[PDB]
């Protein structure tokens, strides 16, 4: 039983009926998935992402990722169709709540010269997306046993209908805004 | 939404296997309908759209059967097998309904092959 999930349905779940006037308890927003991908564009050359971009997201998120292939060829990017260019992991259920705790508690203040996250990064429906620096911040990968550094970007997908309905939800979970 | 996705996705899986499987007057079609609480089944005769026999888990005989939902699928599978033979049917074609053959539906189908129907 992860601590962020039980803290959600103890006081976060009740507080959103006061900030927003819902008439039914099924309308209360809830984060449904957290999607993480590297997006390794330097894999159209050198063919080394199995050792470096799969062995680290397995350690960060818990489960092995999916290798994503290119949909169309681009001549300017030195790319084909069906070429491994992206590496995605999807987090559901109870491993989502443990990743959102472990991101906001011990990970996210290890960004070099960290000052916050911006609250204008909503897509219009209530789904936040930020990005990170490198194979730093997460302790589960070590800095000594790795290849070249590479960053990622993290989606957070809610059931909220609008923007600030998802801003009030992630402020309560523990995303630092400004 | 996911409740509107599941209706549209299973009646598209249901139309795909319907192009090739229709069923006639002497070989009717056993149509299953699987919800979370019960299953319904009926023999449809796709030439004038006329159900000749039907059985369901919402009637009083299937409701008082102990066990899980597969055992209540076996009981309703035995009812429409012995109601098809009261109308002169002994061979049918099996309509998946868009679902996956396995679990409760394969327990309905295998309990209807033991009791007379020859699909």
């Amino acid at each position: 039983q992860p601590r962020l999930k039980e803290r959600y349905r103890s006081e976060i779940r009740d507080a959103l009926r006061k900030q927003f006037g819902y008439g039914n308890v099924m309308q209360i927003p809830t984060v449904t998935k957290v999607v993480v991908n590297m997006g390794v564009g330097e894999a159209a050359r050198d063919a080394k992402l199995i050792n470096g971009a799969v062995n680290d997201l397995a350690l960060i998120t818990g489960q092995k990722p999916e290798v994503r292939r290119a949909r169309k060829s681009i001549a300017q990017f030195k790319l084909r169709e069906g070429m491994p260019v992206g590496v995605r992991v999807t987090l559901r259920g109870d491993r989502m709540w443990e990743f959102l705790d472990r991101l906001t508690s011990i990970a996210l203040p290890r960004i070099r010269d960290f000052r916050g996250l911006s609250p204008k990064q909503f897509d219009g429906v209530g789904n936040y997306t930020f990005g990170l620096a490198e194979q730093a911040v997460f302790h589960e990968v070590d800095v000594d046993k790795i290849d070249r550094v590479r960053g990622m970007d993290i989606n957070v997908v809610t059931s909220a209908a609008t923007d600030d309905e998802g801003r009030a939800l992630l402020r309560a979970l523990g995303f630092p805004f400004k | 939404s996911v409740s509107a996705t599941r209706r549209i996705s299973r009646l598209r899986r249901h139309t795909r296997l319907r192009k090739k499987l229709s069923g006639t007057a002497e070989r009717p079609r056993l149509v299953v309908h699987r919800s979370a609480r019960h299953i319904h089944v009926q023999l449809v005769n796709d030439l004038n759209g006329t159900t000749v026999a039907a059985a369901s888990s919402i009637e009083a005989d299937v409701r008082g059967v102990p066990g899980d939902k597969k055992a209540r699928s076996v009981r309703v599978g035995q009812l429409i097998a012995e109601r098809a033979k009261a109308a002169g049917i002994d061979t049918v074609v099996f309509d998946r309904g868009g679902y996956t053959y396995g679990g409760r539906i394969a327990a309905l189908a295998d309990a209807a092959r033991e009791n007379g129907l020859s699909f």
């Binding site: 992860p2 397995a58 350690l59 092995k64 491993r95 705790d101 203040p109 960290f114 589960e140 630092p176 | -």
Partner: protein, 57 residues
């Protein structure tokens, strides 16, 4: 596929230099992830030319 391809993800205790500690589930072997900065001992979680001419004179 949820069998013997995923790495080891067992329960884990994390301590901090401040004294805050909690228990989650991570991939670190031994359950001994140790941080030096956390969500309570970090800043931002807890907080002209005219004035320099006057300071010279």
């Amino acid at each position: 596929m949820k069998s013997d391809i995923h790495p080891a993800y067992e329960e884990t205790t994390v301590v901090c230099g401040c004294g805050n500690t909690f228990q989650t589930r991570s991939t670190k072997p031994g359950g001994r992830i140790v941080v030096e900065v956390c969500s309570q001992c970090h800043p931002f979680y807890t907080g002209g030319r005219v004035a320099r001419f006057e300071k010279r004179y």
